[PDB]
Design an enzyme around this catalytic site. Structure first.
Site, PDB file in Angstrom:
ATOM      1  N   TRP A 188       2.395  48.057  64.271  1.00  0.00           N
ATOM      2  CA  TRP A 188       1.410  49.116  64.151  1.00  0.00           C
ATOM      3  C   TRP A 188       0.024  48.515  64.139  1.00  0.00           C
ATOM      4  O   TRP A 188      -0.340  47.785  63.237  1.00  0.00           O
ATOM      5  CB  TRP A 188       1.629  50.003  62.922  1.00  0.00           C
ATOM      6  CG  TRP A 188       0.721  51.207  62.936  1.00  0.00           C
ATOM      7  CD1 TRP A 188      -0.396  51.384  62.190  1.00  0.00           C
ATOM      8  CD2 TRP A 188       0.839  52.375  63.764  1.00  0.00           C
ATOM      9  NE1 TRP A 188      -0.967  52.593  62.471  1.00  0.00           N
ATOM     10  CE2 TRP A 188      -0.236  53.222  63.445  1.00  0.00           C
ATOM     11  CE3 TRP A 188       1.756  52.790  64.736  1.00  0.00           C
ATOM     12  CZ2 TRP A 188      -0.431  54.472  64.065  1.00  0.00           C
ATOM     13  CZ3 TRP A 188       1.560  54.040  65.359  1.00  0.00           C
ATOM     14  CH2 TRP A 188       0.473  54.858  65.013  1.00  0.00           C
ATOM     15  N   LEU A 226      10.584  46.769  68.398  1.00  0.00           N
ATOM     16  CA  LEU A 226      10.947  48.149  68.530  1.00  0.00           C
ATOM     17  C   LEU A 226       9.742  49.035  68.424  1.00  0.00           C
ATOM     18  O   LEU A 226       8.880  48.824  67.574  1.00  0.00           O
ATOM     19  CB  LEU A 226      11.923  48.522  67.440  1.00  0.00           C
ATOM     20  CG  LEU A 226      13.217  47.704  67.497  1.00  0.00           C
ATOM     21  CD1 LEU A 226      13.747  47.413  66.112  1.00  0.00           C
ATOM     22  CD2 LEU A 226      14.249  48.391  68.369  1.00  0.00           C
ATOM     23  N   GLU A 281      10.206  49.536  80.376  1.00  0.00           N
ATOM     24  CA  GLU A 281       9.323  50.013  79.326  1.00  0.00           C
ATOM     25  C   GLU A 281       9.083  48.986  78.249  1.00  0.00           C
ATOM     26  O   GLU A 281       9.856  48.075  78.070  1.00  0.00           O
ATOM     27  CB  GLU A 281       9.883  51.311  78.761  1.00  0.00           C
ATOM     28  CG  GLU A 281       9.689  52.507  79.684  1.00  0.00           C
ATOM     29  CD  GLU A 281       8.542  53.417  79.278  1.00  0.00           C
ATOM     30  OE1 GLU A 281       7.722  53.056  78.415  1.00  0.00           O
ATOM     31  OE2 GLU A 281       8.411  54.514  79.821  1.00  0.00           O
TER      32      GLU A 281
END
Ligand SMILES: O=c1ccn([C@@H]2O[C@H](COP(=O)(O)OP(=O)(O)O)[C@@H](O)[C@H]2O)c(=O)[nH]1
Ligand SMILES: NC(=[NH2+])NCCC[C@H](N)C(=O)O
Length: 303
Positions: free
Chosen positions: A26, A199, A232
């Site tokens: 994050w 992830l 991706e």
């Protein structure tokens, strides 16, 4: 199986066992929309990301879980994470600034002037003057901006998703040895030059992942909607520090003005290494490189 073959070249299946940490990330563009004693990680109805990582960590209490964070964080917000680390002690918060990426870096002065020379060295009747005159103004702008401005610095918090998708790829280069490099406790159990599994905060652990096997020890998320497939950055999993396929991508970033993490580093790096010369279809690469796991509900942010 025990292997898979691509482009006529053969590729053995390599183990990623339950030591191998899950990585989340994050990069928070703004910390001050959080409480200064709130974990500066987003947990909201549309994406309650802070819930998706804990539940991940709970489903895997005996594998290490990294939270790759970055943002101008208040002392209290760093201790929100601190509570988070002792209240769950497989979770390891890792600050981007606590890692040194100087060995993978480059100056845009260098990178531009390289291409300026390449183009000027080509036939004037052949060459991309359109590009030739863009890299010189990019040049013109960086000089005036800042002499010693590099790739790594450029891709800053200002530059949106290039901020966190760039540093992601760096992280994986450093792999599991980065838990050691920031100094994180109870990580002696990680193997050296060992891999990891990034992830998206939104790929949901449901059940235990187990021991993964890969073609050369690398796989990435592949989108498949409806009639489309893409590769991706939502999942990235390698078996070691400084995997070649990503290494080649880091080179393509060093040898292209205006390289991009997604198109150049991730996508072409994988595929030039795996398919340097384009014998197999794009899709037939997407299939070959696809990361399969039934115990993850993949990329739940689309819903
Ligand atoms: O402010 C942000 C937004 C996104 N991400 C990263 O982007 C990933 C996926 O983002 P999301 O699923 O929300 O967007 P998508 O790319 O799927 O549109 C997250 O797991 C984060 O690692 C981040 O670090 N900071
Ligand atoms: N790396 C990723 N999973 N990126 C997101 C792909 C899906 C995207 N959220 C969508 O609108 O369908």
């Amino acid at each position: 199986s025990g292997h898979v073959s691509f482009a006529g070249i053969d590729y053995p299946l390599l183990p990623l066992n339950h030591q191998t940490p899950l990585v989340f990330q994050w990069f928070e563009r703004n910390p001050d929309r959080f409480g200064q004693n709130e974990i500066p990680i987003i947990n909201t109805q549309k994406n309650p990301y802070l819930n998706n990582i804990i539940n991940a960590a709970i489903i895997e209490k005996e594998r290490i879980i990294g939270i790759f964070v970055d943002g101008d964080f208040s002392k209290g917000q760093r201790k929100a994470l601190g509570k988070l680390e002792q209240n769950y002690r497989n979770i390891k918060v890792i600050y981007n600034s606590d890692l040194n990426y100087s060995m993978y870096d480059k100056k845009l002065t260098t990178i531009y002037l390289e291409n300026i020379t390449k183009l000027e060295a080509q036939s004037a009747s052949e060459r991309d003057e359109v590009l030739l005159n863009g890299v010189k103004k990019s040049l013109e702008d960086v000089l005036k901006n800042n002499p010693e401005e590099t790739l790594i610095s450029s891709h800053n918090k200002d530059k949106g998703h290039l901020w966190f998708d760039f540093y992601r790829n760096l992280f994986l280069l450093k792999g599991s040895d980065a838990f050691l490099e920031a100094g994180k406790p109870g990580c002696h159990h990680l193997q050296p030059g060992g891999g990891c599994i990034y992830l998206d905060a939104d790929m949901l652990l449901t059940d235990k992942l187990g021991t993964l096997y890969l073609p050369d020890g690398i796989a990435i998320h592949v989108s498949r909607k409806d009639n489309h497939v893409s590769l991706e950055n939502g999942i990235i999993a390698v078996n070691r520090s400084e995997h070649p396929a990503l290494i080649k991508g880091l080179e393509i970033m060093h040898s292209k003005p205006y390289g991009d993490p997604y198109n150049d580093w991730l996508s072409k790096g994988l595929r030039h290494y795996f398919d340097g010369s384009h014998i197999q279809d794009y899709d037939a690469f997407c299939d070959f490189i696809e990361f399969k796991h039934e115990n993850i509900i993949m990329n739940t942010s689309s819903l």
